[PDB]
Design a protein around this ligand. Sequence first.
Ligand code: BCL
Ligand code: BCL
Ligand code: BCL
Ligand code: BCL
Ligand code: BCL
Ligand SMILES: CC[C@H]1c2cc3[nH]c4c(c3C)C(=O)[C@H](C(=O)OC)c4c3nc(cc4[nH]c(cc(n2)[C@@H]1C)c(C(C)=O)c4C)[C@@H](C)[C@@H]3CCC(=O)OC/C=C(\C)CCC[C@H](C)CCC[C@H](C)CCCC(C)C
Ligand SMILES: COC(C)(C)C/C=C/C(C)=C/C=C/C(C)=C/C=C/C(C)=C/C=C\C=C(C)\C=C\C=C(C)\C=C\C=C(C)\C=C\CC(C)(C)OC
Ligand SMILES: [Ca+2]
Ligand SMILES: [Fe+3]
Ligand SMILES: [Mg+2]
Lengths: 42, 38, 40, 49, 259, 42, 41, 44, 44, 43, 43, 43, 43, 41, 318, 277
Amino acid sequence: SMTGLTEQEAQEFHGIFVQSMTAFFGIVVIAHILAWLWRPWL
Amino acid sequence: LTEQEAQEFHGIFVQSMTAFFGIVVIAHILAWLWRPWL
Amino acid sequence: TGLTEQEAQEFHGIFVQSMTAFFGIVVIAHILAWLWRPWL
Amino acid sequence: SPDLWKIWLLVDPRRILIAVFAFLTVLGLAIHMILLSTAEFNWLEDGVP
Amino acid sequence: MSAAITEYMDVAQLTIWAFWFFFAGLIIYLRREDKREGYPLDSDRTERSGGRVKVVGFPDLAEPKTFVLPHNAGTVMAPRVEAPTSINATPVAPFPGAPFEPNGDPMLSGFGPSASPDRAKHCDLTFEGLPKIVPLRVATDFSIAERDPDPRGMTVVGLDGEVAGTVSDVWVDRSEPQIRYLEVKVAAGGKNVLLPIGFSRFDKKARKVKVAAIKAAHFANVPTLAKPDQITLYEEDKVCAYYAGGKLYATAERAGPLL
Amino acid sequence: SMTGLTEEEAKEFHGIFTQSMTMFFGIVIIAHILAWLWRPWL
Amino acid sequence: MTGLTEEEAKEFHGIFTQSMTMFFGIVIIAHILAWLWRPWL
Amino acid sequence: MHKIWQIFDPRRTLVALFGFLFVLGLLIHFILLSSPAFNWLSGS
Amino acid sequence: MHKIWQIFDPRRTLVALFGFLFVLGLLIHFILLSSPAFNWLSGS
Amino acid sequence: MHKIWQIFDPRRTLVALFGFLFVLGLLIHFILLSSPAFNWLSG
Amino acid sequence: MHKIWQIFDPRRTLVALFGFLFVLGLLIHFILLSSPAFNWLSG
Amino acid sequence: MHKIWQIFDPRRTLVALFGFLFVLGLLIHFILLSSPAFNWLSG
Amino acid sequence: MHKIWQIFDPRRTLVALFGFLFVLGLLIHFILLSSPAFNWLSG
Amino acid sequence: HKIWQIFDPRRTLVALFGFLFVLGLLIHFILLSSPAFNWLS
Amino acid sequence: PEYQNIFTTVQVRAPAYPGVPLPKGSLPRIGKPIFSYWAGKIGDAQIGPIYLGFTGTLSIIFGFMAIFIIGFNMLASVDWNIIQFVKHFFWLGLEPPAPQYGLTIPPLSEGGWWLMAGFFLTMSILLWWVRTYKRAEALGMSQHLSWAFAAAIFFYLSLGFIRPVMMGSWAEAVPFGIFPHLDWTAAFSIRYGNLYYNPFHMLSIAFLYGSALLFAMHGATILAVSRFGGDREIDQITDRGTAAERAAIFWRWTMGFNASMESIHRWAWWCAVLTVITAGIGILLTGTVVENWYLWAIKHGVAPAYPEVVTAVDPYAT
Amino acid sequence: AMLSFERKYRVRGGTLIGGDLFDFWVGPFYVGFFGVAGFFFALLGVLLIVWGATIGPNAELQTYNIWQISIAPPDLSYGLGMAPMTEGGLWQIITICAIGAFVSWALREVEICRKLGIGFHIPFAFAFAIGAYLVLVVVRPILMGAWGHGFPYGILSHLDWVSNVGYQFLHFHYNPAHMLAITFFFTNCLALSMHGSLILSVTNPQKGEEVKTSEHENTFFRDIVGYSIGALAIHRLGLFLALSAVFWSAVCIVISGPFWTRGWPEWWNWWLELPLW
Ligand code: BCL
Ligand code: BCL
Ligand code: BCL
Ligand code: BCL
Ligand code: BCL
Ligand SMILES: CC[C@H]1c2cc3[nH]c4c(c3C)C(=O)[C@H](C(=O)OC)c4c3nc(cc4[nH]c(cc(n2)[C@@H]1C)c(C(C)=O)c4C)[C@@H](C)[C@@H]3CCC(=O)OC/C=C(\C)CCC[C@H](C)CCC[C@H](C)CCCC(C)C
Ligand SMILES: COC(C)(C)C/C=C/C(C)=C/C=C/C(C)=C/C=C/C(C)=C/C=C\C=C(C)\C=C\C=C(C)\C=C\C=C(C)\C=C\CC(C)(C)OC
Ligand SMILES: [Ca+2]
Ligand SMILES: [Fe+3]
Ligand SMILES: [Mg+2]
């Protein structure tokens, strides 16, 4: 009620937000695997 | 602004971004061939 | 910007044509520059 | 370009002439001064003749 | 990349020269914005050529810009063109640059320090659309601060110390809560005239308002407003300009010179 | 329209603007040819 | 867009061309004298 | 969890999220460059 | 995905994106010119 | 992409672009001059 | 508990809480990076 | 050339012209005095 | 030359000329006072 | 004697007296700067 | 004598103005406004309310962490003695890392705390910049304040981040202390050969001097015509009154040219902004492309030459 | 020429001295009696500056480089007396011309204020700048006992004077009045940018928006810092900050040398030596 977004509007944005965040985290995970192969830090 | 223009702009934006990323990938391949950094 | 698609197609046509002309002599300049002193 | 004259329908061809003449003069001044700064292309202090 | 561009040129020298080109361009821009008011200039150069030569100097004028006034009060262009206006004065001498002597009574001439433009004949509006400068009789929720003397009932005296009237009411700005005008009941004909706060010197101990601008007898000719409970931008300038003329016209000694 | 210039005036201006620019470039080319003869930089 | 008629534009151009040409003439003579006095190239 | 967007505006949150991510990305890249063992712009 | 442009103005996004990318591209070129390993204007 | 001029004013974009290219042209020329390897003004 | 959100604004609290946690997380990593014994970006 | 006075105000021209000549006259005298080769007041 | 006063008013001109002459006279005297060979107050 | 129809004789006396006093001060100070003519020594 | 409009003689009280309504989804303004009598004598009596959004809250948290770290290290530097903390407070400071560490992260007391304070303060300043951007945007106003704040931030970043990174050393950055950062300012000029001869230092001073000149001119001008309602500058800009005319005419009769009621604020805006823009540029040039500004001035014929009435024999030239 | 609304303001009278004799305009400028006096004060001072440049420090060091031109005050050995023209006497005459030009400029502004019926804030504010100059070349040299303490008239040479005077106290940043003056200068620049931004952002609002009101101005800074000083009071504040900076700068230089001869950091020893610590 403080943002003027309905339950369905919040439901649909969350689906796209989670999917977009998942793809970003996927690229990040791949980038760190490559970074680890280049030069491990632990 | 409207809903229909959103897909119109998005299609051109995606293609323009794809073309820009394509040149970027080519430039980095050439840069890697010239002098690799890793 | 108050510019309908009628007048946004020929401005783009000249703009692309001028850009190609500008990029055409840029490439020649860099080819001459590369022949003079390659930077890579 | 088949029709380059259409440029003068969006930029006034009076303040463009003033800007071009001012710009070319300043650029011409700059390049002369750059050459004067150079020990090779300074034509007033090179001793030739 | 190095600090030296040639044997003599270096990066610091190029950077300072780059600034001068920008600064020259900036001054041209600022001078162009300066010339959105009062241009083209009024000159004998234009008068003698019959308007064929416009005096604008350099840089010339910019394209008009639009100010969309709130509450659909109209759109005003800054580099506008105003109708020619005739001054109420005659030159003291015919050579260019000579001043002018106001015609008739200088206080009522509307010339010099009493000159004023014709502003829009509508009141200045608050953000909600109510008139901004209103008397305290209609701005009921407005009140004088407890620690300050209430101007109502104070005596108004002129330049010479003669009583001009009493403060019947106080006019305040509703948007910013400050006093703008003192409504003075003139004790010569019982007609209420406005006294701008800028021409008012409060004497708290004696509850007296001192007006050095004009004499007590000059309050009868202060410009009046069409509506008693609101003042337009046009009338604000007329009231303030009349008092301003007193700073030069109220007394013979005020025209100078000291010696 | 935008500049108060008609299509025929822009055709007129462009022809002489091109002619003046071409002649200015011609003087420039001669100047650089003389400059190159005087002291080449490449 | 300047208030100048067709005839004045041609008339001003004629005097302007002559005055510029004469000024350029004196400049050329001065530079010839300057070159003889002390050549710079 | 989908009700987090009934509390926070998606447009403002996304801008702030992208802004923080970009600054965080620059911060981590700068820390790695500042550390000699992970500076990839050294040729070694 | 295409729904992003409902809230984000395409006119403001493009100019900000172009300004951001140019500054980022300018910064990276300057960083490489600073590093002797990747300075292509040193002649070596 | 002809539609890009719906949102970008042709007059404002053109002069800004030409000014942008000029300063970039100055910047690259000056960077080359600062480099002793590519300085064409030295002997 | 749960009534804590009847006196604390959930919108203001989460931003303050997440901001503090982010600052705290940055601070601890900075301290560990400062420590030679725990700096993980060395040889 | 008499028509230059239909372009330029004679009064504004003379003030600008006389002011420039006076400044130019002072400038050359000062320049000569600054060089010992042409300073006529040194001896 | 009497028509010069139809161009230059005798009000602004006559006081400007006297001021310029006085400053010119002061300047020349100061110049001579600053020149050792023409300083008449040297003794 | 016609100078008084362009200069007000009452304003002129103030300017004249201001001018002469300033001039007299300058000359005295110039003499004081000159060791040969500095009488305060 | 005449009312000089320096102090408000009679103040009027109205119910406290909540503020122009913000768009939907904005946090309510916090704080119940009060009325200070003395604040009303010189200015507006109302204090508050303030808007504390998400960005302002984060800036506060980042900002406090920086200030707390600085103060803690100041207190640690006097071995926790709170009495000695007060005595030496002006002299206390948080030093940047030592030169031998370069751009690496040193131990806590050897510059590590400085980097954290530098980073947290930088984040709060950047967050505060976003806050100024959003407050203007929420009110439909333009972003002139954000641009001017960004100019000040650019100079701040040049002092402590950009230039030290360019130099490859955190030891070039500014200490967090009252007198220590003055010592840095003096040492900076001394180290790089008299910053007076930095042309961008000269420009920065011209604009800093010009800012005081313009505000004195503009402030006195508006007070001079405030009897005609000249302080109501928005009305004068949109509908030019006699206050704006007399103000413009005064300066035209004085110095031959004038601004408008609107463009004087463009002169004001640019003079203040150019103070820190040139300040930042001049800092970035120092040590990177110029080693000694006095010798740079000698090279470019800027430094005056004085007759050699005093000289020293160089003991190294033997 | 004159502004399109200016003709109705060009009125005779309001002169302090001269009456109708000098009451006229030259182009845009109003001259009056003090415009005539100020112009020839300035003309003589400028011509003596050029002459001082023409003779220079000496024949070999003479230069017309505008950065290097310098007219120096006398040696301190001359005290408060007049010096020979080439040994600082030219500086003394130029200083007198400068004082005449500045005061005439201020008095000409007074006459313009009287013509327009406006307040005298502008000449009053300019008097502070004149007072700061008078402290530099009159009050401090007199207190120090020599005209040679004035700063030289040169674009870069007067910076060398500021540098060396500053290091006569070993660390000039610790000058308490200097710190206060700098605080006002920096605050004034901050206040000027804020005021310029607020006026511009309101009269030039977002695209497709109307001009904002005084409520928007007050609301804007209340939303940021929690306080709005007001449209009228920001001009009082800007004037106060600018004049306070100059007042405390005049104090800071007049106490340096006349009223304090040690290093400026040593002045704070009163605080360090308090028995509280
Ligand atoms: C360094 C080696 C040479 C030298 C190498 C070059 C080279 C190479 C060039 C010049 C050019 C120029 N040189 Mg050179 N030049 C030297 C030394 C000098 C000296 C000097 C005292 O030492 C001077 C004063 C000049 C001056 C000039 C100008 C005549 C000209 C640039 C004008 C311009 O910018 O127009 C720009 C502004 C305008 C308004 C142009 C307007 C164009 C119009 C539409 C065409 C008709 C012009 C009209 C009749 C007015 C005449 C103006 C002319 C441009 C002169 N040179 C040395 C000795 N010089 C440039 C040139 O040839 O330009 C013509 C050029 O390319
Ligand atoms: C010894 C040093 C070790 C190390 C030991 C540890 C330890 C121990 C911890 C971390 C933790 C973290 N480390 Mg580590 N870490 C190292 C090096 C790194 C490097 C690096 C470039 O070297 C990076 C970028 C990180 C980054 C991180 C973060 C992912 C995380 C802190 C998050 C936080 O503060 O949230 C606070 C900020 C917020 C804004 C909180 C709000 C979160 C979001 C916005 C809300 C989501 C709601 C959701 C339902 C709740 C789950 C969230 C989860 C994070 C998924 N570490 C080295 C190798 N690191 C911490 C962690 O695991 O936290 C999860 C932790 O305890
Ligand atoms: C370092 C080795 C070489 C050198 C290597 C290069 C290389 C590589 C390049 C240049 C380029 C340029 N060089 Mg180079 N150059 C050198 C030294 C110089 C010197 C000098 C003093 O020594 C000068 C004055 C120049 C000058 C120039 C310019 C002609 C040009 C930059 C244009 C620009 O900035 O556009 C910015 C300004 C604008 C874009 C304004 C727009 C107006 C113009 C007219 C656009 C027209 C568009 C289109 C062409 C119109 C035609 C359409 C048809 C007529 C229908 N070079 C040295 C000797 N130089 C660049 C170039 O060739 O660009 C053309 C380039 O790529
Ligand atoms: C080598 C150095 C020589 C020397 C060589 C030269 C040379 C060469 C020239 C002069 C010239 C002049 N010299 Mg000399 N001169 C020397 C030493 C001096 C000394 C000095 C105290 O030492 C002084 C005061 C002068 C003064 C003068 C001026 C009389 C004159 C410049 C006037 C001017 O600039 O008009 C410009 C100012 C104006 C025009 C303003 C006018 C004001 C009024 C309102 C307008 C009236 C116009 C009037 C009706 C017509 C004017 C012309 C008339 C026919 C008289 N010389 C030394 C000894 N001198 C120049 C000259 O002869 O010019 C006539 C000149 O060419
Ligand atoms: C090593 C040197 C020392 C130092 C030694 C000194 C000395 C010595 C002095 C200062 C003074 C000042 N210092 Mg300090 N100062 C130092 C470092 C600083 C730093 C810094 C960032 O580190 C700052 C911000 C300052 C700031 C200041 C100001 C408070 C003050 C200069 C303003 C002023 O006096 O206005 C006053 C303004 C004027 C005097 C201008 C007068 C204007 C006149 C009336 C009009 C002239 C008209 C003109 C001729 C018109 C020309 C016509 C054109 C066509 C326009 N200092 C260092 C540590 N400082 C000065 C001061 O306080 O003086 C009072 C001073 O003397
Ligand atoms: C007091 C607050 C600030 C302030 C205010 C202020 N200044 C003012 C005013 C005000 C209110 C005016 O009304 C008046 C004005 O007209 O402004 C446009 C002015 C003014 N402030 C000016 C400059 C100025 N103000 C400065 C400072 C300040 N002014 C303060 C910071 C500075 C600094 C810090 O350096 C300068 C350079 C002028 C633009 C103008 C006054 C013009 C004037 O007096 O004209 C008469 C003189 C001439 C026309 C020429 C000079 C004649 C001399 C004989 C030459 C010798 C001068 C000097 C002794 C040697 C050279 C100096 C060296 C250091 C290089
Ligand atoms: C209520 O408060 C309490 C009592 C709790 C604590 C009180 C504390 C007190 C009294 C604090 C007092 C502080 C004072 C007086 C501070 C004075 C500060 C001054 C004068 C500072 C002046 C200048 C400082 C500057 C310009 C610093 C600039 C630093 C910058 C820009 C640093 C940037 C650093 C970055 C971005 C760090 C990067 C770190 C990398 C390596 C990524 O990190 C890993
Ligand atoms: Ca030669
Ligand atoms: Fe203002
Ligand atoms: Mg230190």
